[PDB]
Curated annotation (Swiss-Prot), chains B, C:
Keywords: DNA-binding. Signal peptide: none annotated. This is Single-stranded DNA-binding protein. Residues 1-104 form the SSB domain. The gene is ssb. The chain holds residues 3 to 120 of 165 of the full protein. It comes from the Bacteria. Homotetramer. Interacts with RecA. GO terms for molecular function: single-stranded DNA binding. The keyword Repeat does not apply.
Length: 115, 114, 114, 115
């Protein structure tokens, strides 16, 4: 029993594809979820918190991401919340191990190809 | 305090775009979600959820997706209690979609930016 | 790849503890979840989910909760397509519970550690 | 549209109740979600990642938490993911603004009182 979450947002930049020594592909990126707060006084719905989530995806699904998504795409993401330890000069970070992901058809249309 | 859910699965039938005489557009599609563990091992159970999305998105949906497409759907769980004048006691569930996209798990897609 | 949901709401009726002749214990309860925004404004819509939990938890549930209790439920969305030999075409949904607890939003509780 | 999540875990310590200058109560705590990985070789299900989430809850619901929960209780939590900026000597942190919360009846029974 892991802690999963769905994140809707935009990619801060282009997907970053590298390779492990053994050859498996990995893509990393952050998504930016911006909520809209109502403001029951002056103006209608405004822009809320930031929320920058670093997700990393693997092997052949990561290959697909690198080929389909770019800077500032609106995506839907579902994944597991992981926690990593980085060294000072020492605390934690929170990332999203991606299970599924795809371009949101809210403001865009897509041309899909199955493998 | 609405109950929301995320659902991954494949569409069971091409989307059904329709227009309200008020000029608004609507898409209806149902998602079939099916677990699948492996070895000694495969398949297991299923879930069919009637879904609907409104406005622009609905048009993009009907243009981008087809039967069998693996989509990720997020939305709200709506429920109605129909009939009683027949004796019975029926109930149905649907999902008012917020966001939806094709999955890039087994596919690649060219996202025509629009 | 199971579809899970979180649900907040009140129990509609005291839990129904039962024992299987195999010595296992089972709890059945349905949650009613109802949105409620305010001013000019109150109430709106509803959701009834048949729930079931097994084993130890089931015993604790039947001892801790009653009708009207506000619980937080997390679990799995199970669905069955019953009947057809009647002409019709019925479908029902239930929730196989993983975790459940009373909500401390409008209540306090003394958690007898056990 | 915020990013919400459900966290099941245990409180690392006792709830910490303070008060804003105006009088509103606030409770803070971290929950510890430990997943169990199967290990299809030697041993059955093991203990997985850590996952420490700092949740903070407000006014009169926080009062209720401070009165009902203690060190190492198993709780269910549902909330929004917030991101805060702390000063170096400068990056971000991720916390959970709690909506609802309660003791899980998995291994414990509870005696509830309505207000």
């Amino acid at each position: 029993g892991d802690t999963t979450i769905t994140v809707v947002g935009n990619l801060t930049a282009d997907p970053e594809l590298r390779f492990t020594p053994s050859g498996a592909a990995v893509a990393n990126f952050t998504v930016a979820s911006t909520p809209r707060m109502f403001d029951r006084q002056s103006g209608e719905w405004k822009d809320g918190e930031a929320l920058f989530l670093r997700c990393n995806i693997w092997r052949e699904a990561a290959e697909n991401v690198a080929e389909s998504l770019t800077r500032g795409s609106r995506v839907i993401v579902t994944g597991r919340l992981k926690q990593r330890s980085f060294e000072t000069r020492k605390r934690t970070v929170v990332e999203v191990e991606v299970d599924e992901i795809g371009p949101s058809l809210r403001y865009a249309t897509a041309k899909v190809n199955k493998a």
